Amino acid sequence: IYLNPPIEECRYKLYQEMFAWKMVVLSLPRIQSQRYQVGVHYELTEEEKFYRNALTRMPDGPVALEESYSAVMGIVSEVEQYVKVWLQYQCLWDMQAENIYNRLGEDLNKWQALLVQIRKARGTFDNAETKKEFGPVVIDYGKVQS
Amino acid sequence: EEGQSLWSSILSEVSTRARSKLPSGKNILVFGEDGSGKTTLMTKLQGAEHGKKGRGLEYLYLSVHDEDRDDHTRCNVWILDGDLYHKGLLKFAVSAESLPETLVIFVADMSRPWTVMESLQKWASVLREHIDKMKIPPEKMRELERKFVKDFQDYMEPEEGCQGSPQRRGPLTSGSDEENVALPLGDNVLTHNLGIPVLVVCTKCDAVSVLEKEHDYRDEHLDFIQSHLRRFCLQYGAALIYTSVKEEKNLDLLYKYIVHKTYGFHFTTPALVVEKDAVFIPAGWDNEKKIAILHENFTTVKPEDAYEDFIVKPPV
């Protein structure tokens, strides 16, 4: 049981619409304060070509960048919790029958109650949802539920 | 609840009996200055050339695919800027649980070698107020430092027979305590060691080759910088890599040292000394007598010159 694309790519994707949504503003060019001269048509940085110091000129402090990034870490934490809901159940594909069967022995009520548990847990694993969304962010898990 | 706790103990023990993965949740910090190809080589360690270069807390991931058990984790990348107004983004980078899951990388720019040590002790001071503010309990913090003293003394430089299989820096003769590298302790040695794997990377060491001819330096210029670097990295327990960003000098060496320091793997290369913009300085290898070995090579200079004046900063 595995997630593709993983949690690092999910965080990377949220940081990609960070990057596109911040280079709405940052990839705007800034204007040379004289233009018809020669010396600023010599080599410039991104802080001399583009308006990228307006991110350094946040007037209320940097506070909404940590608010957005904490929203990213909270969303990554919640989808990380739901992907390690279903990564808990890789134990059935790690399952060796000897660790069950030498533990149970021949006491029949353990086998009967275990068949009750596999029926009850298969009742839980046949539920209606195949895709879980937090905010916009979607897990696909329907194929692995089947 | 006999069979339920029995079966829950079975599901705890069965996933223990499976194949081990690299433990995820690892973070990698980039300290240092902008304009140095932090994003560039950090994408090279990801597997790319250049990424979507933002600013502040840039994120990537390193594709750490295992070659032994053939698994793949990806560890977190937090490229911090040169700005100290957006330096407050590091609480999403590293916490105290994942502070042992952290390989700290410092950028030294060798395109701007004159601004190195003030940025080093400034970002190290940032890291010190950071490491005071993140509030580790001090018994585990001193446990990390005492075991870092332990693995610091465990190190050997690799031989030709240690460029394959892992060099046994633990017990070769089993169940004992013997010295491997015994450091002469000074005030440049481990006095603000933090108990974590720390690294400083010299970036753009092909821009030294500008200043070997367009500034016309000598051999004792790099030993001045390098002895100051040895004094400060040995004070925090670190290694030192001399890299060119643009020519991409020995990326696999870097990746082997990253997986070697994070998950206890092997870094399969000896400490290079032979090319002056590619001198490898490990952790637990160099000491203050080795700093004085550069002073044997000090023929025309004494080490008490100024940092921007001996290593000539142009006023722009």
Q: For residue B29, give the amino acid letter.
A: L
For chain A, state the CA radius of gyration: 27
The reply to whether residue B14 touches residue A94, judged by beta carbons under 8 angstroms, is yes
Check A69 against B85: CB less than 8 A apart: no
Burial B227-246 (b: 16+ CB within 10 A, else e): bbbbbbbbbbbbbbbbbbbe
Alpha carbon distance A75, A17 (integer Å): 14
Experimental method: cryo-EM
Rounded CA separation B48/B62 (Å): 10
Q: Map residue B202 onto helix, strand or coil.
A: strand
Nearest to B10 among A8, A11, A99 (CB): A99
Best residue in A24, A55, A75 for a mutation probing chain B (most B CBs within 10 Å) = A55
Q: How far is A95 from chain B (nearest CA, A)?
A: 6
CA distance B230 to B240: 8
PDB resolution in Å = 8.2
Walk across the sheet containing B198-203 and list its strands.
B57-65, B72-80, B27-31, B102-109, B198-203, B238-242
DSSP-derived letter for residue B71 is: -
Closest by CA position to B283, among listed B266, B252, B261: B261
Q: What residues are paired with B289 via a beta bridge?
A: none
Residue with tokens 């949504």: A21
Pairing of strands A137-140, A131-134: antiparallel
- Going B111 to B112 to B113 to B119, the CA torsion angle's sign is negative
Give the C-alpha distances (Å, rounded to integers) separating B97 from B93, B104, B135, B312. 12, 15, 11, 43
Whether the CB-CB separation of B121 and B200 falls below 8 Å is answered with no
Beta bridge partners of B241: B201
